[PDB]
Scaffold this active site. Structure first.
Site, PDB file in Angstrom:
ATOM      1  N   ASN A 290      -2.014  13.621  -0.258  1.00 22.58           N
ATOM      2  CA  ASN A 290      -1.204  12.390  -0.532  1.00 22.58           C
ATOM      3  C   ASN A 290       0.217  12.900  -1.281  1.00 22.58           C
ATOM      4  OD1 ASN A 290      -0.765   9.468  -0.749  1.00 22.58           O
ATOM      5  ND2 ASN A 290      -0.297   9.918  -2.875  1.00 22.58           N
ATOM      6  N   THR A 291       1.474  12.581  -0.788  1.00 19.96           N
ATOM      7  CA  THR A 291       2.602  12.584  -1.115  1.00 19.96           C
ATOM      8  C   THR A 291       3.153  11.380  -2.068  1.00 19.96           C
ATOM      9  OG1 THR A 291       3.028  14.033   0.646  1.00 19.96           O
ATOM     10  CG2 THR A 291       4.842  13.307  -0.472  1.00 19.96           C
TER      11      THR A 291
ATOM     12  N   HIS B 205       4.088   3.815   6.511  1.00 23.56           N
ATOM     13  CA  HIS B 205       3.286   5.081   6.544  1.00 23.56           C
ATOM     14  C   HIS B 205       4.218   6.206   6.071  1.00 23.56           C
ATOM     15  CE1 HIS B 205       0.969   8.137   8.656  1.00 23.56           C
ATOM     16  NE2 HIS B 205       2.064   8.207   9.283  1.00 23.56           N
ATOM     17  N   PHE B 206       3.506   7.058   5.382  1.00 24.99           N
ATOM     18  CA  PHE B 206       4.272   8.326   5.174  1.00 24.99           C
ATOM     19  C   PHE B 206       3.824   9.361   6.103  1.00 24.99           C
ATOM     20  CE2 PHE B 206       6.784  10.993   2.192  1.00 24.99           C
ATOM     21  CZ  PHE B 206       6.453  12.123   2.291  1.00 24.99           C
ATOM     22  N   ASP B 207       4.700   9.785   6.900  1.00 25.90           N
ATOM     23  CA  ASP B 207       4.374  10.619   8.068  1.00 25.90           C
ATOM     24  C   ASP B 207       4.066  12.227   7.767  1.00 25.90           C
ATOM     25  OD1 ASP B 207       3.607  10.297  11.061  1.00 25.90           O
ATOM     26  OD2 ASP B 207       5.074  11.766  11.469  1.00 25.90           O
TER      27      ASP B 207
ATOM     28  N   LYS C 211      -9.157  10.980  -2.035  1.00 24.34           N
ATOM     29  CA  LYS C 211      -8.304  11.032  -0.622  1.00 24.34           C
ATOM     30  C   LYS C 211      -7.683  12.537  -0.785  1.00 24.34           C
ATOM     31  CE  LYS C 211      -4.060   8.929   1.328  1.00 24.34           C
ATOM     32  NZ  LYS C 211      -2.663   8.737   1.181  1.00 24.34           N
ATOM     33  N   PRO C 212      -7.931  13.024   0.701  1.00 22.05           N
ATOM     34  CA  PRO C 212      -7.575  14.576   0.512  1.00 22.05           C
ATOM     35  C   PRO C 212      -6.166  15.029   0.483  1.00 22.05           C
ATOM     36  CG  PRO C 212      -8.578  13.654   2.630  1.00 22.05           C
ATOM     37  CD  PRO C 212      -8.489  12.654   1.872  1.00 22.05           C
TER      38      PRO C 212
ATOM     39  N   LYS D  28       4.331  11.717  14.238  1.00 19.88           N
ATOM     40  CA  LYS D  28       3.243  12.851  14.915  1.00 19.88           C
ATOM     41  C   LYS D  28       2.421  12.113  15.858  1.00 19.88           C
ATOM     42  CE  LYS D  28       1.516  16.070  12.603  1.00 19.88           C
ATOM     43  NZ  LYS D  28       2.476  17.204  12.977  1.00 19.88           N
TER      44      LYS D  28
ATOM     45  N   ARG E  14       1.943   1.837  -3.681  1.00 18.57           N
ATOM     46  CA  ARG E  14       1.113   2.398  -4.413  1.00 18.57           C
ATOM     47  C   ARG E  14       0.977   3.739  -3.867  1.00 18.57           C
ATOM     48  NH1 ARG E  14      -4.247   2.456  -3.564  1.00 18.57           N
ATOM     49  NH2 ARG E  14      -4.173   1.088  -2.050  1.00 18.57           N
TER      50      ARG E  14
ATOM     51  N   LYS F 221       0.760  -1.249   0.030  1.00 18.16           N
ATOM     52  CA  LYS F 221       0.030   0.060   0.026  1.00 18.16           C
ATOM     53  C   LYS F 221       0.941   1.136   0.004  1.00 18.16           C
ATOM     54  CE  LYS F 221      -3.862   2.144   2.705  1.00 18.16           C
ATOM     55  NZ  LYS F 221      -4.855   1.930   3.552  1.00 18.16           N
TER      56      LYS F 221
ATOM     57  N   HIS G 145       2.573   6.145  -2.493  1.00 14.66           N
ATOM     58  CA  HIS G 145       3.633   6.951  -2.495  1.00 14.66           C
ATOM     59  C   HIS G 145       4.877   6.831  -3.375  1.00 14.66           C
ATOM     60  CE1 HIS G 145       1.375   8.550   0.833  1.00 14.66           C
ATOM     61  NE2 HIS G 145       1.706   7.146   1.508  1.00 14.66           N
TER      62      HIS G 145
HETATM   63 CL   LIG Z   1       0.972  11.409   2.198  1.00 13.40          CL
HETATM   64 CL   LIG Z   2      -5.030  -0.716  -6.762  1.00 11.14          CL
END
Ligand SMILES: [Cl-]
Ligand SMILES: [Cl-]
Ligand SMILES: [Cl-]
Ligand code: NA
Length: 124
Positions: free
Chosen positions: A44-45, A119-121, A41-42, A66, A10, A7, A12
């Site tokens: 995303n990086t 996870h992207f923090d 999705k509000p 965080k 996909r 995930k 990031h």
């Molecule tokens: Cl992000």
């Molecule tokens: Cl997908």
């Protein structure tokens, strides 16, 4: 049923380009990575480095996340990133995003064996 590591890839990773060179980059990428299915999705990086360089961050500077967890790592060097954020006139299903390209340190949370980003923090 997606693993956490997959995930992260996909959502990031975009190693195929060195930088966002267009204002429509986020609109296109948020759709192609299936981040606008069922909802916009509000925020995303996307990171424009090799997967290996991003995975290597899990061996770099250990910092707090965080949310207070201690499995976050900050990249020693800056990386090419694109921040994608919904505009005020966006609403599902016609999701619309602002594209902001920058060079920043990334902060990721890492887990697992192998120990990889899940996870992207933030970016700094
Ligand atoms: Cl992000
Ligand atoms: Cl997908
Ligand atoms: Cl240290
Ligand atoms: Na995983």
């Amino acid at each position: 049923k997606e693993t956490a590591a997959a995930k992260f890839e996909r959502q990031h990773m975009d190693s195929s380009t060195s930088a966002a060179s267009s204002s429509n980059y986020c609109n296109q990428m948020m759709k192609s990575r299936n981040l606008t299915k069922d909802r916009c999705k509000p925020v995303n990086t996307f990171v424009h480095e090799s997967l290996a360089d991003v995975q290597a961050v899990c061996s770099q500077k250990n910092v707090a996340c965080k949310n207070g967890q201690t499995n976050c790592y900050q990249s020693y060097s800056t990386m090419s990133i694109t921040d994608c954020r919904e505009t005020g006139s966006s609403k599902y299903p016609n999701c619309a995003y602002k594209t902001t390209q920058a060079n920043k340190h990334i902060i990721v949370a890492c887990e697992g064996n192998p120990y990889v980003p899940v996870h992207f923090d933030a970016s700094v």
